[PDB]
Design a protein around this nucleic acid. Structure first.
Length: 135
RNA sequence: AUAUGGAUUCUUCACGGUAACGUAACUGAAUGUGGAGACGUCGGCGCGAGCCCUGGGAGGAGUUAUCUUUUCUUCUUAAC
């Protein structure tokens, strides 16, 4: 009956990431010491990869497949859950409550997320997650 | 016309905030969409400015047989 789990894919509705697809890593159903509301820890895409055709060269294909990730704590009311899923075990440990409140630790976590997303995009799977929403 | 400083990049084209949004900056051609320019009249109410009225004090002037701590006057601050 509960669908907000550690593999659910959601759509951000507010906060400079509106219209970006995101995946839930760690949910907190009953608030916390900070953020006194239902919220989840998510990792998403800030810059979707561009479309690739057969005419593009090797140097151009690699440039158009770059993905810029982000990490954010989002209220439940600002998320639109979907029916799609994406396993987060490759970067579940690095993204946690401790990775915040530290400028340097946030950068290291996002580098791990970028590696996982780029490998996920290669050998195409989770195609709906890597396709930008049009609105 | 152009240099310097700052900002950005070895995760190439910035970060923060749950959010409304914030900042010294923080690539964007064709094409497309939207906003501003851009609007009647009357009625009462709220607020601002200039003026009017008035107290104390620091100056100048007038009246003074008698009365009047009194009558008149100066005390200002632009765009940006």
């Amino acid at each position: 009956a509960k669908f907000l789990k550690a593999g659910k894919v959601a759509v951000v509705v507010r906060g400079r990431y509106a219209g970006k697809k995101v995946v839930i890593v760690k949910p907190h159903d009953e608030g916390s010491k900070s953020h006194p509301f239902g919220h989840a820890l998510v990792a998403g895409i800030e810059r979707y990869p561009l479309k690739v055709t057969k005419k593009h060269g090797a140097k151009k294909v690699a440039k158009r497949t770059k993905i810029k990730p982000f990490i954010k704590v989002v209220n439940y009311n600002h998320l639109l859950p979907t029916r799609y899923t994406l396993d987060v075990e490759a970067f579940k440990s690095v993204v946690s409550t401790e990775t915040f409140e530290q400028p340097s630790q946030r950068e290291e976590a996002k580098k791990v997320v970028k590696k996982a997303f780029e490998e996920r995009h290669q050998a195409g799977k989770n195609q709906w997650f890597f396709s930008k929403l049009r609105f």
